[PDB]
Each structure stands twice: as structure tokens, then as C-alpha cells.
Design a protein around this ligand. Structure first.
Ligand SMILES: CC(C)CCC[C@@H](C)[C@H]1CC[C@H]2[C@@H]3CC=C4C[C@@H](O)CC[C@]4(C)[C@H]3CC[C@]12C
Lengths: 217, 336, 233, 294, 68, 53
């Protein structure tokens, strides 16, 4: 029956206890993918969190542990490793607003958003959209008009209407509105107003996960 | 310049030479041998214990222990006979896309999006498992770490390169460049003298270990290649792709031998591994079920539908006792 | 730098109580099943007790089942044997022994220094074929060991361990499961045998290799050792 | 002459008409509840998927219902005829019966508390503490059941409670705990917790909020429809035993018949709950679908 | 014990004071499941009456059921 | 650039390889699969006497 296999099975049971305890510990931990364009405010977002290859930043907020994965360090084909993030709590997307100089970065950001928002994995994972650098964006728009990038923008050359146009133009790219909602927030340089928004937009997905796992539906 | 025209003419010459050495397809040759029949293999064991999607597995050379890595941050070394967990090594970074178990059994390597193949020393003193060596130097993402010996390891990454690391020094000996897309798989020849790497440019290249330069390049897939495995004779290898077909090539004739497409399957292949004799080609698919092909007649000779998620890793033992398929539902079925 | 060092022991009146404690400096203590094994002043080894990892399974020898209790403090890496009602036959040197049980492991790998303890005033019988064998350096000698019950379990491997104890030194594991050499022993030793009859064979002897060789069974508790075959140079 | 008001209120026709209905509902509860709780056990225990506190409480409630429907056939044989000649050891059987009933209601309460703490507060319970709370609730279930089985002493054929040797209001002090302990506290707790989390899921953005509220109201509705007549009959029984309504004769026979029928209905609830609790979600339904292929 | 399996086919609320033994015909203890001990009696009118089970006339009934 | 020269030299090295008739490789693979069918448990199911699963 068992001679040392009793002790081997006991070791396996202790290993099972450690695996289940670590699964409980890491199943209540919020996972935030962090995507965006090159030389954008992603590093500024990571800096504003009060703490090659993939980078993980851990931080506690409202007694909730957030792992935030800045993965844009590696440059390869995203389709072969994005399924590793099927099951992140939220996708913090980042968009620099004041960039139109590389050979048109805002169109590249829109292509990245369109490619990442309609994955077969990310149907239910909500996207927290950040629009960085409001001051430099306002200086740029008062210096150069929006017609260089979007000719069909019809309205005032002011901050509010152009910002709303960019925000809606990002939001309407999603083809599954009922499954997830784009929580667009204007990051700027504002201190302690970003993490609270992340917590607010993540508690709804946490409640949905609780509803799914508790067996109500 | 005209060098692109010269390269096109040279590729045309290669194709013409290949069609000059082709006389009859493998289906024509083996149209007279009897089929293997339906291969009914049941789930003998079920290695439960991972908390996330399993992305890799490599059997031991003793055909009993198997190490499997998952995104819960851990890779587990299982005693597959008794379904135990010999070891549960927690990763430094939870993102892992590959794992290997050394032929001697002392070492276990694994790599992922951290761009480091971490090599753990199992049969050491002090009872626990410690990083023997963290090999860094890739700039993409490692998709396959594979062991040659206890001291050499070939790793294929997402920077379009393979590499041959000397473990005790840590510096890669030879870098295998020549791919244009991310190299998603790697498979050693039984004599560990050559190997084949399948990349996302729909090409499998036969690299020479001792020299450091590619010898042969095989094309014929329309889409990305996610798996590759040598035929046990060492003079052929299958190639699993996203074109929902495996393609059995060969090294000596340097051509395509057989295609394993089927109308009922439309999504790709995540893992391929031959049987011990090589007659049966087991291919793990992403339509939640494995398929067992009669590799000399292209007849779908079995279906393994025990998983309810994508079968990401497949492995046949060296003695051919069993075939274990681990999937994204955290389960490692062991069919036989 | 694996180091098990015992503390406690010494002189004690009969019927009293005394606590032994071995500190385990240099390894991952919490993963290791531990044993207490005692050796009488001029006799062979005797197994006393065993704790698993995490104290989930504890076994005692039937002789001392009840008079001794055993415990482990994993955070301070210490193993305690609290001895109560020390009768006359407990005067012995005690070793706390490391042992990890997985597939292909080598239990009873390391043996502590051991402390003496002097007082005042179906078990598988493993028997050595003799108690002393004449020997010269450079000669291959075979040491036999007899078992009451067939140690060949149904799963294939026979649980029998060969230990060597140098004069004035703690015993070291030589062979585990009759065929596998321990990590750190030379390739001279080779074990063979059927389920009942077992044989160690040493070729190309050296000067420091002489000592007392014990054969232990590990099929079922209690783990009865052998009488001990000694080699004299 | 004689004494006119000492004519007993007979119960022959009550028992004769009660036997077929009671035996039928007992058999229905036995087979439906046995398969419905064995499905939960095989769906959770074999896959070893006890990862959240919800799994622990589902396992405990299914085990309580399983023990209930396993003590049920002994009562069925105890009722059939007099062939059950001392083969039914009253005290332990009643003990397990009442412990199972009160444990099922206690774990319904614990499921509601766990859902309430996980949703409106996000204060989850680890399985290491879920086992502690499970043994605490089982201990409490035995503690709330001792004034029900500490008196049931067997006799030649059937079970006894010597109310003459007991206090004046022992049936009062037993059935008032049977209503308040087993119907007022659990219904109040599940109603408050489920209304709070329904208010939460009304504001939250979900694609199945209507279905969630439907299931949440449906479980409480099933509880009410299956237990409320039983505790109304217990309430008017308490009125009678406190000499408060008319002390009639045929009223007692009708009350006894209704009491047996409503007891059977409560047993039907203890039969019917596991599919409403466990198999109402797509998770455990899909888990069952991949397990039935053995 | 739940109310579904109680077997007191005869149940009493008030105990009789004194019945002459001549009118009484048969006496038999109630179905023992509800605790309060009583003896149900069939009389010459063939209707049912309670009696406290300590009344000696049952013994006299036991006499004249079988002495005759 | 240098990539064109590297690729054309690689194709020159790949072209100058003695390729055999594909019928010969097919026959070799068929012979290998016929000469190892007795040692393949997956193809021919072995009984429970030797099967460790
Ligand atoms: C009949 C009465 C008096 C006693 C009933 C004993 C049984 C039915 C009860 C009492 C304690 C209960 C256990 C308490 C703890 C756990 C651990 C939990 O993770 C799974 C359920 C499990 C395993 C319960 C199963 C049912 C259980 C064993």
C-alpha cells in the first residue's frame, strides 16, 4: 500500500496546502495590465504610484493589493503573449495627448486601442483609459490646431471640446459596449486623484467577479 | 540593389532543386500499408494543483517525473505514477511560457516574459530548490528553454533569436540569428547535434549546435508556427501552426512530406509531439481537444477531449508509456 | 554547511526527566521529516521516534511509546525530545537524523553529532550475518544482511539503507534503497540482493573506511537497525 | 350518570389519511434530495475545488441535507407499521434529524452572511477560517438541538417525551425555539443580507443584474412558501398549548393534519435547496457537465 | 420528535372524576407516544372516556372481563 | 545593406546540400515506423501487467 509513500503523500498534501493558500492570497490581488504608446506618460503613471522584459509594481491602496504590469518594455508580436493576461482585473490604457510628431502617434495609439480592445480574451476585462499631459496638450492645441491629425474635427480650437472629441473618439472604437466600459480619466499631474479613480473603477469588476464566483448567476 | 533579384533567383533555384528531387509523396508511398486503427486512450491520471493556465511541461528521461509551469507563479514537479507533487518551485516572476526538465534530472529551467531562463537545482543539499543560474540576455520573450546537458541550454526567444547558454559561466556561447519573426518553439534532435526552431514567420530552421549557423530552412506554412518536434529517427520533424494543420517535413530530402489539415478543425495547434516509434503524431489543439494522427496516412486516428480549455502543452515520454496533455484549465491529463 | 548539533543529556537520575534539543543550522528545516535514533554505549543503533514535516504524523518505537514525547520548533529550527521516566536502559548517545521523503530522495542523509545520556542505578528483525570481519586495505569485502520479511514492496523498490559509522563519528548514509549511493560517498560501494537477502560490497578499500556498518529497514515502522558489522584494519 | 366533557379527541382518521401522503412525500424527499446532494458532493469533492468559503459552506449545507435524508428512511420505517420493533434507536435518530435541520438553516444563514461580507464590504473569509466557522456552526447546531433530543426516550414500539415529568411549558419552550431560532433568525438574516447585496447589484453595472435579483428573490420566496405554513401551524399550536384559542376538539385534529403536511413541506424544502443554491450558477453547472462523463 | 410521527391516536384534556365499574366494559392504556399517561375506556354506551391510569377499577374490569 | 549579403550567403549555403529523392526518405520513415511498432505502447495498447498507469 504505502511504506514511504505515506510520507510522500503527506509532503504532497502539505504542498497542496501551500498552493491553495497562495492561490487564496493571489486571487484577491488586483491585476492591472498597463498598455500604451512609446515615450508616453506610462512611466509618469508608474512614478505617481506611491510604492528588461515585463515590469511589476506592487502597491497597497485602501487595504487592497495591486500588481500593475508594465509590459511595454519588450518589443515583439503582442498576439503571442497577450493571452497570458486573459484574466487581469483591469487594463490601464495610457494615451499621451500632446504628441503628433513621429512619422501621427495619436493614430498609432488608436490602432493599439482598437487592437487591444477587441481581443477574444479582453471581452470582459474593463479598460481604464488615461489621457496624460493636459497642460502640454493645451499649449500644443493653442499653438497648433487639431486639423493636422484629424481634419474632420468641426468645432472650437479650445481645450474642452477637443478633449471631449478625443475621449469619445477613443470610446467609440469598442464593439462590445455592454460587456465592458471605458473609464476614461484625465490624469494630468494630479496627485492622489488617480489611484482613488483606479480603485473606484476596479471595485465594480471585483464585485462582478464576486457575483460570478459566489454562484448567484 | 540587384541582390534581392539574386536572392529571388536563388530561392527559385532551391525550389526547382526540391522539385527535381521529388518523385512520390509519402501518401503515395504508404498508400499500401494497413492503418493503425482507432487509438482509444483513456485518462489514467489527472495532475491537479495549479491555480492558473498551464503553459508548458517536459517529461523526465526516467519517464516518471514531469515539471509543469503555470501562470499562478509556480512550476510543479509531479510524480506522475502516484499523482504526487515532488516539488513546487515558486517563480520570481509569475509570467512563464516554457519549462524543461534536464535529462539527468538535477536541473529544471523555465522562462517567460521576464526575458530570463531561470535554472533551478533540484537534487542539491538543504532540501529546497534554489536558482542555480538566471540566464539573461534576450530582448523578446522566451518561448522554449531546452536542456542539452547539465551545463548547456538552448533557449528560443521573441527577439527572433535562439541561443546556446553555458550555464556555469552564464554567457551564451552561440547566438542563432536568422529568423524574422518571434521563435515560438524549439526541439532537440535525439543525438543533441542539431535542432529545429519554428518561428512566427511560417518557417522552421535547422540550426547546428556545434557550429552556430543554420543549415536548412523549411517553409510551407501560411501562418504562425507554435510547435515543433523531431521524429524519433532524427531525420524528420513535425510542425504545428496556426493554419490548423501540422506539417511533417524531413531533413535529408529537405522538403515537405505530409500535411495534416482537416475540414472540421479551423483553429491552430499549440503543441506537437511524436510517439516513441513515431507512427503516431499527437498534436495539441486550441479547440480544447488533442488529435492523434496516423503520421504515415494522415488519418485522424484519435481524439482526446478531456479538457474544457485550450491544450497548451503536450508531452510523450521517452519510453512511450503515456502522453500527458496540460491545458489552460489547470489540468494535466495523462492519456494512455 | 549542513549542521545538526544536539544539546542536553548528561547525568540524570533514573525515573527523572530530561529534554534534548538539536539545533538545525544550515538547511531548510521545515521541509524535513526528522528522526531521533539512539545508540547504546556498546550496542547497535535503535530507532526512537520520527516527526513528519509540519508535525502531521508522529511515530514512536514500541519500547518507548509513551514515555518520550517529540516536537519541533520550525521558526527557530530546533527539534525537541522531552524524555520522561528515564529507566536504566535509556543511557545512550542520541542523534537527530534528517530525512526527506519524495520520489528519488535520500532519507537519513545526515546525522547529528549526538549527545550522551547517562542514567544511574511485528517488528522486522534485521540481523547482520556476523559482528566482525577481518579485512586488509585494497581488498573487496561483502557484508550480508538478513530480513524477517520481504522488503520488496509492490511498487518495486526495496526499502533498505546501509549506514557506516566511523570510530568516534556519527553514522553517515552510504546506500539508500539497496542500490542508490548517497550524495558524497565514493563509487566503491554497491548493494544487491533479493527481497530478503541483502549484500553490500566494497571494492578497493582505504584506511579511513573501516567502521561499523548497519543495515536498516524502512518498509514499516519501527525501523529496526542491524546488529552492526565491524571492520578492523 | 357520567362526565360529559371528558370525551377524548380521537386521531384515527387523521393518522390513516396522513400515512399515504406522508410516506409519499418522505420517499420523494429521500430520492430527490439524495441525488441532488450527491451531485453537489461529486461536483465539489472529486475535483477538490474547495477554493473559496462559498465552496466550504455549500459542502457543509449539502452534508447537512445528506445526513437529514439519510436519517429520513429510518423515520419512514418507524412510521410504516409496528414491524420496527426496537430497530430504531429514538434518541440518536432524533438528534441527527434535528441537528441536520438546524444545521441546514444555520448554513443557509452562513451562506447569506458570506455573500453579504464578500459583496457589500469585500471582507472575504479564507478556507482556513471557513473550516473553523463550519465547525462552530455545527457546534451551534448541536447546541440549539439539545432541548429537542435530550428528552426523547425510547419505549416498547415508539418514542416518548414525558411532558408530565417535564415542566409545565416545555412544549412551549421547545417549539418557540423551533420557530424563532429556525425561522425568525434565518429568514431575517437572509432577507437583510440579500436585500443589501441586491441594492448593491442594482447600482453595479452587470449584464445579469436582473437575473441575479430574480434568483435572489426566488431563494427567499422558496424559503417563505415552504416554511411559512409550518411556522404558522407551530404558532397556532403554541396558542393552543398556552390555552389561548378555544381549546376545541376537531380543531385539534385539523391542526394536527395540517402540522404533519407542513412538516413534510419543510422536509421538501430541505430536499429542494441544493439546486437552488449551487446549481443555479453557470459555474457549477458547467462543472457538473464536465464531470458527468465519468 | 417532529410532529409527523407522533402516534397518540387517543388524546385527553380532562380526567374523569368517578365512573361506576358496572357501567364500564373495557379499559386499555392510550397509545404511548405523547407522555401524559391515561387509560381510554369503552363503556356500555360504546363511547369513549378518559380515566387516570391509577384508578383501581381497571383491575376490577380485568376481573369481570374474564371471570364471566 | 549587410542583411542582403547575409541572406544571399545563407541561401547559397542552404542550396548546396546533397538532397536525396523524397521516396528514399519516405521509405526510411516507413521502415522506422514498421521496425518500432513492437516497442510503442501508444499504438498497440499494452496490458495492465506492464503498464504503470
Ligand atoms: C451528527 C452530528 C452530531 C455530527 C455530524 C458530523 C459531520 C456530519 C460534520 C461535523 C463536522 C463537519 C466538517 C467540518 C469541517 C469541514 C471542513 C470543510 O472544509 C469541508 C466540510 C467539513 C469536512 C465538514 C463535513 C461535515 C462534518 C464532518
Amino acid at each position: 500500500l504505502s511504506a514511504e509513500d505515506k510520507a510522500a503523500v503527506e509532503r504532497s498534501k502539505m504542498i497542496d496546502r501551500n498552493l491553495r493558500e497562495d492561490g487564496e492570497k493571489a486571487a484577491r490581488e488586483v491585476k492591472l495590465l498597463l498598455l500604451g504608446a512609446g515615450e508616453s506618460g506610462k512611466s509618469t503613471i508608474v512614478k505617481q504610484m506611491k510604492i528588461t522584459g515585463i515590469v511589476e509594481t506592487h502597491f497597497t491602496f485602501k487595504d487592497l493589493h495591486f500588481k500593475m504590469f508594465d509590459v511595454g518594455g519588450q518589443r515583439s508580436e503582442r498576439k503571442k503573449w497577450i493571452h497570458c493576461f486573459e484574466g487581469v482585473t483591469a487594463i490601464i490604457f495610457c494615451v499621451a495627448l500632446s504628441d503628433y510628431d513621429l512619422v501621427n502617434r495619436m493614430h498609432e495609439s488608436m490602432k493599439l486601442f482598437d487592437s487591444i480592445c477587441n481581443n477574444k480574451w479582453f471581452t470582459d476585462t474593463s479598460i481604464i483609459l488615461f489621457l496624460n499631459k493636459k497642460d502640454l496638450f493645451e499649449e500644443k492645441i493653442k499653438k497648433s490646431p487639431l486639423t493636422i491629425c484629424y481634419p474632420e474635427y468641426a468645432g472650437s480650437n479650445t481645450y474642452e471640446e477637443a478633449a471631449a472629441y478625443i475621449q469619445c473618439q477613443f470610446e467609440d472604437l469598442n464593439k462590445r459596449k455592454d460587456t465592458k466600459e471605458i473609464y476614461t480619466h484625465f490624469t494630468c499631474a494630479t496627485d492622489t486623484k488617480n489611484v482613488q479613480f483606479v480603485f473606484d473603477a476596479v471595485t465594480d469588476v471585483i464585485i462582478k467577479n464576486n457575483l460570478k464566483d459566489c454562484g448567484l448567476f | 540593389d540587384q541582390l534581392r533579384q539574386e536572392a529571388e533567383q536563388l530561392k527559385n533555384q532551391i525550389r526547382d532543386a526540391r522539385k527535381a528531387c521529388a518523385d512520390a509523396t509519402l501518401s503515395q508511398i504508404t498508400n499500401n500499408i494497413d492503418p493503425v486503427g482507432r487509438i482509444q486512450m483513456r485518462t489514467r491520471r489527472t495532475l491537479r494543483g495549479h491555480l492558473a493556465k498551464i503553459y508548458a511541461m517536459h517529461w523526465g528521461t526516467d519517464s516518471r517525473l514531469l515539471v509543469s509551469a503555470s501562470q499562478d507563479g509556480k512550476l510543479i514537479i509531479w510524480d506522475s505514477y502516484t499523482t504526487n507533487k515532488v516539488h513546487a518551485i515558486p517563480l520570481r516572476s509569475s509570467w512563464v511560457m516554457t519549462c524543461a526538465y534536464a535529462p539527468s534530472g538535477n536541473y529544471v529551467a523555465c522562462g517567460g516574459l521576464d526575458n530570463i531562463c531561470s535554472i533551478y537545482n533540484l537534487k542539491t543539499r538543504e532540501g529546497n530548490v534554489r536558482v542555480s543560474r538566471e540566464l539573461a540576455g534576450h530582448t523578446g520573450y522566451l518561448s522554449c528553454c531546452r536542456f542539452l546537458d547539465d551545463n548547456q541550454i538552448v533557449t528560443s526567444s521573441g527577439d527572433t533569436t535562439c541561443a546556446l547558454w553555458d550555464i556555469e559561466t552564464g554567457q551564451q556561447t552561440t547566438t542563432f540569428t536568422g529568423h524574422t519573426g518571434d521563435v515560438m518553439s524549439l526541439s532537440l534532435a535525439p543525438d543533441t547535434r542539431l535542432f529545429v526552431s519554428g518561428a512566427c514567420d511560417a518557417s522552421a530552421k535547422l540550426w547546428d549546435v556545434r557550429e552556430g549557423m543554420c543549415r536548412q530552412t523549411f517553409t510551407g506554412h501560411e501562418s504562425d508556427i507554435n510547435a515543433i518536434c523531431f521524429f524519433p529517427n532524427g531525420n524528420a520533424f513535425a510542425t504545428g501552426s496556426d493554419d490548423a494543420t501540422c506539417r511533417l517535413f524531413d531533413l535529408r530530402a529537405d522538403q515537405e512530406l505530409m500535411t495534416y489539415s482537416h475540414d472540421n478543425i479551423i483553429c491552430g495547434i499549440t503543441s506537437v509531439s511524436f510517439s516513441k516509434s513515431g507512427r503516431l503524431l499527437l498534436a495539441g489543439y486550441d479547440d480544447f481537444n488533442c488529435n492523434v494522427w496516423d503520421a504515415l496516412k494522415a488519418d485522424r486516428a484519435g481524439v482526446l477531449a478531456g479538457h474544457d480549455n485550450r491544450v497548451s502543452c503536450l508531452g510523450v515520454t521517452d519510453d512511450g508509456m503515456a502522453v500527458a496533455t496540460g491545458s489552460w484549465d489547470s489540468f494535466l491529463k495523462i492519456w494512455n | 554547511d549542513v549542521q545538526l548539533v544536539e544539546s542536553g543529556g548528561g547525568l540524570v537520575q533514573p525515573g527523572g526527566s530530561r529534554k534534548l534539543s538539536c539545533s538545525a543550522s544550515g538547511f531548510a528545516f521545515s521541509s524535513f521529516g526528522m528522526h531521533w535514533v539512539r545508540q547504546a554505549p556498546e550496542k547497535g543503533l535503535e530507532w526512537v521516534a520520527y516527526i513528519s514535516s509540519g508535525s502531521g504524523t508522529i511515530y514512536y518505537a514500541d519500547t518507548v511509546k509513551g514515555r518520550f514525547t517529540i516536537s519541533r520548533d520550525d521558526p527557530k529550527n530546533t527539534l525537541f525530545l522531552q524524555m520522561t521516566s528515564l529507566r536504566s536502559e535509556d543511557t545512550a548517545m542520541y542523534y537527530c537524523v534528517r530525512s526527506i521523503y519524495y520520489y528519488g530522495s535520500s532519507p537519513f542523509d545526515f546525522w547529528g553529532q549526538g549527545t550522551t545520556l547517562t542514567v544511574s542505578s511485528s517488528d522486522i528483525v534485521m540481523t547482520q550475518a556476523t559482528s566482525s570481519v577481518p579485512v586488509t586495505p585494497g581488498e573487496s569485502v561483502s557484508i550480508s544482511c538478513r530480513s524477517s520479511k520481504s522488503l520488496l514492496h509492490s511498487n518495486g523498490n526495496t526499502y533498505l539503507y546501509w549506514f557506516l559509522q566511523r570510530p568516534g563519528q556519527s553514522p553517515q548514509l552510504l546506500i539508500y534503497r539497496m542500490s542508490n549511493l548517497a550524495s558524497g560517498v565514493p563509487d566503491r560501494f554497491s548493494g544487491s540482493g533479493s527481497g530478503t537477502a541483502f549484500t553490500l560490497t566494497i571494492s578497493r578499500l582505504e584506511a579511513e573506511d573501516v567502521g561499523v556498518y548497519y543495515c536498516m529497514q524502512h518498509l514499516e515502522y519501527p525501523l529496526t537497525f542491524g546488529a552492526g558489522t565491524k571492520l578492523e584494519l | 350518570d357520567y362526565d360529559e366533557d371528558a370525551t377524548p379527541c380521537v386521531f384515527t382518521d387523521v393518522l390513516n389519511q396522513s400515512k399515504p401522503v406522508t410516506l409519499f412525500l418522505y420517499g420523494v424527499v429521500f430520492l430527490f434530495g439524495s441525488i441532488g446532494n450527491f451531485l453537489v458532493i461529486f461536483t465539489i469533492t472529486w475535483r477538490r475545488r474547495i477554493q473559496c468559503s462559498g465552496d466550504v459552506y455549500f459542502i457543509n449545507l449539502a452534508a447537512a441535507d445528506l445526513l437529514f435524508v439519510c436519517t429520513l428512511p429510518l423515520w419512514m420505517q418507524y412510521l410504516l407499521d409496528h414491524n420496527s420493533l426496537a430497530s430504531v434507536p429514538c434518541t440518536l435518530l432524533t438528534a441527527c434529524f434535528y441537528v441536520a435541520m438546524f444545521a441546514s438553516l444555520c448554513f443557509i444563514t452562513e451562506i447569506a452572511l458570506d455573500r453579504y461580507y464578500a459583496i457589500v464590504y469585500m471582507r472575504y473569509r479564507p478556507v482556513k477560517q471557513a473550516c473553523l466557522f463550519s465547525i462552530f456552526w455545527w457546534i451551534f447546531a448541536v447546541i440549539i438541538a439539545i432541548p429537542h433530543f435530550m428528552v426523547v426516550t425510547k419505549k416498547d414500539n415508539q418514542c416518548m417525551t414525558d411532558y408530565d415529568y417535564l415542566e409545565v411549558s416545555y412544549p412551549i419552550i421547545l417549539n418557540v425555539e423551533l420557530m424563532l431560532g429556525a425561522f425568525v433568525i434565518p429568514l431575517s438574516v437572509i432577507s437583510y443580507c440579500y436585500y443589501r447585496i441586491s441594492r448593491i447589484v442594482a447600482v453595479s453595472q452587470s449584464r445579469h443584474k436582473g437575473r441575479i435579483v430574480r434568483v435572489l428573490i426566488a431563494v427567499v420566496l422558496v424559503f417563505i412558501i415552504f416554511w411559512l405554513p409550518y411556522h404558522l401551524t407551530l404558532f397556532v399550536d403554541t396558542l393552543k398549548l398556552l390555552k389561548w384559542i378555544s381549546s376545541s376538539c376537531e380543531f385539534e385534529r385539523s391542526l394536527k393534519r395540517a402540522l404533519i403536511l407542513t412538516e413534510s413541506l419543510a422536509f421538501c424544502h430541505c430536499c429542494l435547496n441544493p439546486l437552488l443554491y449551487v446549481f443555479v450558477g453557470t459555474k457549477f453547472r458547467q462543472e457538473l457537465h464536465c464531470l458527468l462523463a465519468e | 420528535q417532529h410532529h409527523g410521527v407522533t402516534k397518540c391516536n387517543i388524546t385527553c384534556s380532562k380526567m374523569t372524576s368517578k365512573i361506576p365499574v358496572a357501567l364500564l366494559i373495557h379499559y386499555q392504556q392510550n397509545q404511548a407516544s405523547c407522555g401524559k399517561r391515561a387509560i381510554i375506556l369503552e363503556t356500555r354506551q360504546h363511547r369513549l372516556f378518559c380515566a387516570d391510569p391509577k384508578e383501581q377499577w381497571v383491575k376490577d374490569a380485568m376481573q369481570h372481563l374474564d371471570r364471566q | 545593406i549587410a542583411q542582403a549579403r547575409k541572406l544571399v550567403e545563407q541561401l547559397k549555403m542552404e542550396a548546396n546540400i546533397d538532397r536525396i529523392k523524397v521516396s528514399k526518405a519516405a521509405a526510411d520513415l516507413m521502415a522506422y515506423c514498421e521496425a518500432h511498432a513492437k516497442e510503442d505502447p501508444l499504438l498497440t495498447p499494452v496490458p495492465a501487467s506492464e503498464n504503470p498507469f
